[PDB]
Every structure is written in C-alpha cells, then in structure tokens.
Design a protein around this ligand. Structure first.
Ligand SMILES: CCNc1cc(=O)[nH]c2ccc(Nc3ccnc(Cl)c3C#N)cc12
Ligand SMILES: CCNc1cc(=O)[nH]c2ccc(Nc3ccnc(Cl)c3C#N)cc12
Ligand SMILES: [Cl-]
Ligand SMILES: [Cl-]
Lengths: 123, 5, 123, 5
C-alpha cells in the first residue's frame, strides 16, 4: 500500500556526492598508480562487483587503503568513480578503451555494455 | 512528486 | 558531454538497502524508546536534515549510538528509515500522525508535505 | 537504459 517519491533515489545520490566532495565520512582511499581517491565503501560496494567482494571479505572490510592493479588507468577510474556518485558517464573517443577496461576490472556490467556498443558503432 | 509505484 | 544511466540511482539505493538487511558496514545504532535500528550514517545524512546536522558535528560524527527524543514513535521511525532506503513510504490512517511528527523531527520536508496533503484530504 | 541527460 506504499506511495513512492520519484526523485528520492537521485536526491540521495546527489547528497552522497556532496559528502564525497566535502570529504565527509569517507572511509577508504583507493590508490591507482599512486593517484589517490577518497570514497565511501558502501557506495563503491553498491556500484561495483569488485568492491562488493572486497568489502564483504572479513579481513579486507577493515582496510582504509585499497591498491588497484598497476595496469588500471587513473583517469578511467576517476571517470567511473564520478559515474558511481552521479549516474553520468563522461565517455569520449580518447578515454573509452581505458573506461571499458576499468569497468571490466571493477565489474560494472552496464558500463561495459555501453562501451562495447559505442566501440561497435565506430567500426 | 509522489506516485503509486 | 556525459551520457546518463537512468536506473543507476535506484539500483544504488536497492544495494544500500540490501547491505542494511545483511547488516553489512552499518556504523550506527539509532535508539528510539529502547527499540534499536542499525543503519549507515551516510544514508541517514543524505535523507534527513537532523542526521545531516548530527553527523557533521565534530563530536557526534564519532558516536556509534544516537538516542532520539523519547516522544518519537518507534513505528514512525521504522517507516521513515524504510523510506530512506527504498523511496517507498508506508503511509496509513493508523500511522500518519506518528509518521508526520517523526518526519518533522527528522527534517524530511517532502514526507511532511505528503502527510499534510493526506490529512487535509480527510478533513 | 542510457540517455542524453
Ligand atoms: C548500481 C550498479 N551496481 C552494480 C553493477 C554491476 O555491474 N555489478 C554489481 C555487482 C555487485 C553490486 N553490489 C551488490 C550486488 C548484490 N548485492 C549487494 Cl548487497 C551489492 C552491494 N553493495 C553492484 C553491482
Ligand atoms: C533525499 C532527501 N534529503 C533531504 C530531505 C529533506 O527534507 N531535508 C534534508 C536535509 C539535509 C539533507 N542532507 C544534505 C543536505 C545538503 N547537503 C548535504 Cl551534503 C546533505 C547530506 N548528506 C538531506 C535532506
Ligand atoms: Cl554499471
Ligand atoms: Cl523527504
């Protein structure tokens, strides 16, 4: 018998991104080839199969720093982190290969899907 | 907004 | 130049609610007349003016337990906590007064708005 | 789903 407020989920995400901007209650640093990105473990888990596996592990859930594979591109990661917190993906000819490789590693299937479609269209 | 889901 | 994945925000909220169900990375207990509710501080802050003020305070941000005013109804709080994590509000004739009073205390304006409208319609 | 926002 519930009623639903259409904008609620987007408003929550907007506020989570504002907390990230303001570095409020961020609880992990993701290190990508020495570039560092502060984030909230719960948002990362909610968006990525890799982070869901990492932060549900009984030892890794307590880590304050996570180092990604050295082959991961920091710009690709930055673009995906922004997508996690905003639903908007800054996909460009110059970054699509890195974004797709990063999304495959992070296990973000919808992103991998749109990257494949954009690449196939340019062939 | 509010709707019947 | 971004593209946007329409369902992303709702999918993130669905996953945050799954973490809450499974008590994964919950970091606060809200006590309402001895009833206890586990939650994520970031979701509470993202949904409520009261929790935003509490968890941005330099001392209160570190508390693992928050006690609400004794006049707050635990069922009203439970209904609002479910709304925070799902966008669906279980508003009924038997709970609307408690839900509205709780939403006013929690500073959730959209909820206070729909409660006022539903009450005005029954007058 | 993907759209132009
Ligand atoms: C918003 C997009 N999300 C994902 C996209 C994707 O392509 N793959 C995902 C794998 C896992 C998760 N996260 C969960 C999956 C199932 N249960 C829980 Cl409790 C979580 C959490 N937290 C999320 C995604
Ligand atoms: C999703 C609905 N949210 C709210 C509803 C409401 O009626 N009142 C609100 C007061 C405050 C906040 N939270 C914020 C406000 C501004 N900046 C930041 Cl960083 C946060 C956070 N976190 C949220 C709400
Ligand atoms: Cl995705
Ligand atoms: Cl609200």
């Amino acid at each position: 018998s519930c009623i639903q407020f259409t904008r609620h989920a987007s408003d929550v995400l907007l506020n989570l991104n504002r907390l990230r901007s303001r570095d409020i209650l961020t609880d992990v640093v993701i290190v990508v080839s020495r570039e560092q990105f502060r984030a909230h473990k719960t948002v990362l888990m909610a968006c990525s199969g890799l982070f869901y596996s990492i932060f549900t592990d009984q030892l890794k859930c307590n880590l304050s720093v996570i180092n990604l594979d050295p082959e991961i591109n920091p710009e690709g990661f930055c673009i995906l982190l922004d997508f996690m917190y905003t639903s908007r993906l800054n996909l460009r000819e110059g970054n699509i290969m890195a974004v797709m490789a990063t999304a495959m590693y992070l296990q973000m299937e919808h992103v991998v899907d749109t990257c494949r479609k954009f690449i196939k269209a340019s062939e | 907004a509010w709707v019947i889901p």
